[PDB]
Amino acid sequence: MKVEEILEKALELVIPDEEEVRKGREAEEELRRRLDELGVEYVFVGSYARNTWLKGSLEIDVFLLFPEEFSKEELRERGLEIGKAVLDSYEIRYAEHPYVHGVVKGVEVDVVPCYKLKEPKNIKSAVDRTPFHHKWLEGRIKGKENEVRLLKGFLKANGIYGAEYKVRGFSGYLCELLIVFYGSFLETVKNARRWTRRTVIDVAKGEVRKGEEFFVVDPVDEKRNVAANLSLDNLARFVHLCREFMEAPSLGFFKPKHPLEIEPERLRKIVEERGTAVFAVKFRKPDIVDDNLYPQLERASRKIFEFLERENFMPLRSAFKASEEFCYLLFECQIKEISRVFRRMGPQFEDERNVKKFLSRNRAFRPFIENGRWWAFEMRKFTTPEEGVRSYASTHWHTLGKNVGESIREYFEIISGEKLFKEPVTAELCEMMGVKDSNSSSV
RNA sequence: GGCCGCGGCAGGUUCGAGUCCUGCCGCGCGCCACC
Ligand SMILES: Nc1ccn([C@@H]2O[C@H](COP(=O)(O)OP(=O)(O)OP(=O)(O)O)[C@@H](O)[C@H]2O)c(=O)n1
Ligand SMILES: [Mg+2]
């Protein structure tokens, strides 16, 4: 359990076994065979072309390079055409930039169309930097392949690996740049402890400077932030893990933690012990890609959360879950019920023109003067969070994200109490409420 | 699809809105994700 003895035992978890590598090289050989037959200019990129892919996560990436003059429509129609021809089975489902996900001799393959650029300053597509990323990294990452796999596995085990909107973590390319900048996994962790939200890491200049936000400068484009989609919280979660690790190293930092089935009875006791209002908004999952869904679930959850605050239900945290059929927006509040009456502010006693208008309004109770101005007692239209959210989600369905809001419009329901604990949201509830010992890394 | 702006324009809430909530439109190949 020394710092180095543990990184030894952890390499056995992140390094692919020779039975998987052979399966990868065999698929790579067949892929080049079919691609060469089509006479298309292509290039292998990603973690596979650099031998930095994690164990159990084998995926080959192939970029097809087309002329600059091609329309975005022509790029797609030709890209998808080649892709379908090369892959055994394929699947076309993307958010913006077209590509083909499929299989070749049993391995995951992605055939991505892009432009054959010279100097990637003003890229035309989003993915035109990727060949240039591979060209810059192949010569510098050599020898340090396992130092990347330690960093990737370290993050994946703590659920902050990936730049996708489902994660908002560290892209696999960001990890490689960090190893080139620090040399080893150990040196990244040591230095990561003193990162801040202002840290700028310019790999191209071998410099660490201060800036406006966390910014890892892309060697290929000094305007591009490689860590653009790394949330501030996940940045923090990483720094916290590094300080914890150096303070007390362990192999568990690399073991993926999975949730535990919590009894619906134990959960009912925890919520009762807290005395908070725990409820959820349930609606049909819109049939869209995760990268469109999660930003909207984030938005919807925020809009309802913000509503609860200004309505004085004093919310604690928010959360959401996406099952196969349904989406859930979870909330916890300190106020299960508020009075119907509240005090609305009136004008100062001086200018009677405003006061006369203020006092003319028919109210159930008599207004009063306090500290030099008038006040009135008015009634609320709802006195609980559930009743409030019911109203908001019904009327303001449109502002909860395009697809989510349109799904909430057609139907939604607020689930509370025990009826909630039978839903697929136990894990999300325990994370939200800070329940202890609801996770484990037992194999 | 989400996010950030320069503007706006109207509407709702209010004694009172350039200031809180909402809807619509323009412009930065604006930024990010799908690789
Ligand atoms: N947010 C992202 C994600 C990736 N890439 C580019 O996409 C390539 C590979 O895509 P991806 O599969 O997403 O990352 P991998 O390096 O393959 O990581 P992993 O295999 O673990 O998924 C990288 O070379 C990188 O230049 C990028 O610039 N921006
Ligand atoms: Mg890959």
CATH of the domain at A96: 3.30.460.10
Instruction: Work out whether the CA dihedral A225, A228, A233, A234 comes out positive or negative.
Output: negative
What SS3 class is residue A166?
Answer: coil
Strand B close to A112 by CB, under 7 A: yes
Do A51 and A172 lie in one domain? The reply is: no
Burial class (CB in 10 A: 0-12, 13-18, 19+), A285: middle
- Residues A430, A442: Cα–Cα separation, whole Å: 18
For A411, residues 6+ apart whose C-beta sits below 8 A from its C-beta are A283, A284
- Residues A247, A107: Cα–Cα separation, whole Å: 40
Do A176 and A73 lie in one domain? The reply is: no
Q: How many helices (H) and strands (E) does chain A have?
A: 15, 18
Do A311 and A428 lie in one domain? The reply is: yes
CATH of the domain at A439: 3.30.70.590
CB A128 within 8 A of CB A117: yes
What SS3 class is residue A42?
Answer: strand
Listing from the earlier edge strand, what are the strands of the sheet with A207-210? Answer: A207-210, A199-202, A215-218, A221-225
CATH of the domain at A181: 1.10.1410.30
**Phi and psi, residue A275, nearest 5°:** 70, 30
For tokens 């979660």, the residue is: A237
Strand B close to A57 by CB, under 7 A: no
In this structure, the strands spanning A107-115 and A59-66 are parallel
Do A280 and A423 lie in one domain? The reply is: yes
Do A293 and A428 lie in one domain? The reply is: yes
- Residues A289, A93: Cα–Cα separation, whole Å: 8
CATH of the domain at A353: 3.30.70.1550
Choosing from A240, A259, A278, the residue where a domain stops is A259
Query: Which candidate, A91, A82, A98, places its Cα nearest to that of A31?
Result: A82
Listing from the earlier edge strand, what are the strands of the sheet with A42-45? Answer: A42-45, A59-66, A107-115, A100-104, A89-91
CB A328 within 8 A of CB A281: yes
Q: Residue A332's CB: how many other CB atoms inside 10 A?
A: 20
On strand B, nucleotides with any atom < 7 Å from a protein CB are 1-3, 14-16, 20-24, 29, 31-35
**A392 closest-nt by C1' vs CA:** B21
CB A151 within 8 A of CB A183: no
Q: Which two tokens stand for residue A279?
A: 């409820």
- Residues A382, A329: Cα–Cα separation, whole Å: 20
For tokens 């009826």, the residue is: A419
**Phi and psi, residue A343, nearest 5°:** -105, 120
Do A367 and A226 lie in one domain? The reply is: no
Q: Which two tokens stand for residue A231?
A: 């949330």
**Phi and psi, residue A71, nearest 5°:** -65, 155
Question: Which residue has the least CA–C1' distance to nucleotide B2?
Answer: A295
What SS3 class is residue A201?
Answer: strand
Do A24 and A59 lie in one domain? The reply is: yes
Stated in angstroms, how far is A398 CA from B22 C1'? 10
Do A52 and A76 lie in one domain? The reply is: yes
- Residues A42, A32: Cα–Cα separation, whole Å: 9
**Which residues have CB under 6 Å of ligand 1?**
A 45-47, 53, 57, 59, 61, 129-130, 133-134, 163, 171-173
Count of alpha carbons within 13 angstroms of residue A433, beta-carbon side: 28
Chain length of chain A: 443
What SS3 class is residue A333?
Answer: strand
CB A192 within 8 A of CB A175: no
Q: Give the helix/strand (H/E) hosting A441.
A: none
CB A388 within 8 A of CB A307: yes
For tokens 């400077």, the residue is: A209
Long-range contacts of A303-308 (CB under 8 A, 24+ apart): A303/A396, A303/A399, A303/A400, A304/A329, A304/A331, A304/A389, A304/A392, A304/A393, A304/A400, A305/A331, A307/A388, A307/A389, A307/A392, A307/A396, A308/A333, A308/A385, A308/A388, A308/A389
Resolution of the structure, angstroms: 3.2
CA distances from A442 to A2, A42, A158, A252 (A): 22, 43, 15, 10
CB A259 within 8 A of CB A439: yes
Do A104 and A85 lie in one domain? The reply is: yes
Do A172 and A308 lie in one domain? The reply is: no
What SS3 class is residue A302?
Answer: helix
For A15, residues 6+ apart whose C-beta sits below 8 A from its C-beta are A55, A146, A149
- What is chain A's percent helix, strand, coil content, to nearest 5? 40, 20, 35
CB A256 within 8 A of CB A441: yes
A9 is in an annotated binding site: no
Strand B close to A204 by CB, under 7 A: no
For A235, residues 6+ apart whose C-beta sits below 8 A from its C-beta are A195, A197, A214
Instruction: Work out whether the CA dihedral A309, A311, A315, A319 comes out positive or negative.
Output: negative
Do A298 and A418 lie in one domain? The reply is: yes
- Residues A344, A374: Cα–Cα separation, whole Å: 9
* Cα A93 from chain centroid (whole Å): 19
A19 is in an annotated binding site: no
Range of the domain at A305: 260-339+384-443
Do A68 and A85 lie in one domain? The reply is: yes
Choosing from A353, A368, A383, the residue where a domain stops is A383
- Residues A28, A40: Cα–Cα separation, whole Å: 16
**A402 closest-nt by C1' vs CA:** B1
Number of domains in chain A: 4
Instruction: Work out whether the CA dihedral A350, A353, A355, A356 comes out positive or negative.
Output: positive
Question: Which residue has the least CA–C1' distance to nucleotide B34?
Answer: A95
CB A226 within 8 A of CB A177: yes
Query: Which candidate, A172, A90, A75, places its Cα nearest to that of A126?
Result: A75
**Phi and psi, residue A436, nearest 5°:** -95, 150
Choosing from A86, A117, A143, the residue where a domain stops is A143
- Residues A349, A363: Cα–Cα separation, whole Å: 19
